[PDB]
């Protein structure tokens, strides 16, 4: 089974990956992004609601350690993580595990996040919310 | 049994916690606020009357150590602590154990306390008393 | 619930605020005026009678510190503060928390106060009393 | 005969142990807790009154050796020990021999005890008393 | 037996203490004020006359050490100390051991004493004599 990835993904045109078809959720096994993916997946379990989970994912992309994310969870409940979306949207600001990995590698102090990545209505330091040019 | 939590609680929409129904008193086992909860519970035993107990709780929220709170008790009598109210009121200034934990983490130098949290009629440093918008 | 604001308010046409309907009392949470609002609320408790409370509010708008206002209170009794009126009147001189915030930021040495803001019959430095063009 | 154990006991769902029925008193022979059990039982003979015996049990849970507990007994009278309660109460703070074994292994510096474990009305270092959520 | 305390005492509404009935004399065992109490009691034995003993008690309240108080005693006779009055009077200036403890902790440079605390007719530095509003 092929894993569908973003058109701007570095996995595009590779064996097991495609842009137009494939699985929309994956831990990206066999790649480096795998680690980021599972970390992101765990975040999505730590915060059940998408808004605060996406806030934690944004903080993760800004370089904050996954361990501090773990301590920030109000409860100690630990459930199995679902694979994160490989194509949450189709614009250049898609918060894929690949993009999060790249942002962490570049150690960016500010990120631009589209509207397909729902965030808290209050300000987040280092995050600028923009309109999603085209969606999934 | 589900534990009733504040609508603004980070435990809302989680297993074992609910906003519309549940237990109104809890030590919040399984969370970090648990520690704060039991500390607040101990305070409510050290000062039997709610007014100066709430004053000591407010001082606890302002960062004062619980050891000094134990020191300030006139007597050395120690009785079992009842669980603190998880929903003392329904406004944004509810002095829940979660809110006290958040204020202690932020190391705030001033807090705003609603009228559902009865306080001494004299001034308390770092505490501003406002009307409770909506009560339990 | 929507908070009713002045037609000339900077919060007009915003989420949670309206000109034609809403709550007439608020601490204006989520805005900067919030701080001014609660300060005004505290003033309205320090002086039970409306006229000298409005005198203290006028002195507050003229840049005088809230701390000095606390010392000027004859007694040390501290009761919970009720939310101040967001629309005391409909003219351009309405002494809303937003207007007081604007006057304090501009550091004005003189203000114009309408008749809907009752003041003591004696002169107040930096305050000019005019008729309220239209009332609530 | 079956020995009734706590719902959170590690002996739950095992041969010879049950959660809903069985003997309420046991030395827990065949398990490791056995040793701790008899120690607590011996404590209950050294101090006839439950309050000071429970204080000594709490100190034993904090890591204090049983030899010092024997030394602290005012008299040298040695009577046969009755088996300790396997389920003193149904909450998570039940002072079972299994819980005491776990606390001693973890070398905890502080314990939380419910109200079903009566203690001296004065403070005990490393022990915090809370209400028992549900009893026998 | 219950120990009667001042209506404004921090021991009011506690086990073993009452406002309307109880023992009028106590060393206040189980409280911190106990220490102050016995010190005050010792003073009352050093100076048999009430006015000069109350002068020494006032000096003790102003922060002067008990060792110097012992030094200033004209004789070296040491007699057993009777428990001090827990309720010398019913006004807010009662010279209870609790009030003396509070004054010593506050390190006040001036105190106000009622007429139910007889003093020498000459001036005492840092002590202001007022009429006792209501007596025992
Ligand atoms: Zn997008
Ligand atoms: Zn409230
Ligand atoms: Zn007007
Ligand atoms: Zn229990
Ligand atoms: Zn008096």
Swiss-Prot record, chains A, B, C, D, E:
UniProt-annotated binding residues for Zn(2+): 89, 91, 114, 132
Topology term for the membrane: Peripheral membrane protein
Domain of life: Viruses
Post-translational modification: Phosphorylated by host on serines and threonines.
Cellular compartment(s): Host cytoplasmic vesicle membrane
Subunit description: Interacts with mRNA-capping enzyme nsP1. Interacts (via C-terminus) with host G3BP1; this interaction inhibits the formation of host stress granules on viral mRNAs and the nsp3-G3BP1 complexes bind viral RNAs and probably orchestrate the assembly of viral replication complexes. Interacts (via C-terminus) with host G3BP2; this interaction inhibits the formation of host stress granules on viral mRNAs and the nsp3-G3BP2 complexes bind viral RNAs and probably orchestrate the assembly of viral replication complexes. Interacts (via C-terminus) with host NAP1L1.
Domain topic, free-text comment: In the N-terminus, the macro domain displays a mono-ADP-ribosylhydrolase activity. The central part called, the alphavirus unique domain (AUD) has a zinc-binding function. The C-terminus region, also called hypervariable domain (HVD), is mainly disordered and binds several host proteins. This intrinsically disordered domain contains 2 SH3 domain-binding sites and 2 FGDF motifs necessary and sufficient for the formation of nsP3/G3BP complexes.
Role: Seems to be essential for minus-strand RNAs and subgenomic 26S mRNAs synthesis. Displays mono-ADP-ribosylhydrolase activity. ADP-ribosylation is a post-translational modification that controls various processes of the host cell and the virus probably needs to revert it for optimal viral replication. Binds proteins of G3BP family and sequesters them into the viral RNA replication complexes thereby inhibiting the formation of host stress granules on viral mRNAs.
Record's protein name: Non-structural protein 3
Record organism: Chikungunya virus (strain S27-African prototype)
Higher taxonomy: Viruses, Riboviria, Orthornavirae, Kitrinoviricota, Alsuviricetes
Covered residues, full protein: 1507 to 1642 of 2474
């Amino acid at each position: 089974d092929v894993v569908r990835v973003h058109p701007d993904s570095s996995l595009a045109g590779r064996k097991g990956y495609s842009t137009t078809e494939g699985a929309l959720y994956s831990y990206l096994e066999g790649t480096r992004f795998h680690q980021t993916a599972v970390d992101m997946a765990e975040i999505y379990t730590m915060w059940p609601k998408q808004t605060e989970a996406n806030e934690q994912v944004c903080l993760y992309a800004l370089g904050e350690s996954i361990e501090s994310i773990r301590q920030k969870c109000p409860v100690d409940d630990a459930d199995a993580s679902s694979p994160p979306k490989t194509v949450p949207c189709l614009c250049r600001y898609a918060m894929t595990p690949e993009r999060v990995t790249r942002l962490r590698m570049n150690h960016v102090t500010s990120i631009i996040v589209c509207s397909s990545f729902p965030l808290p209505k209050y300000k987040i330091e280092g995050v600028q919310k923009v309109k999603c040019s085209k969606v999934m």
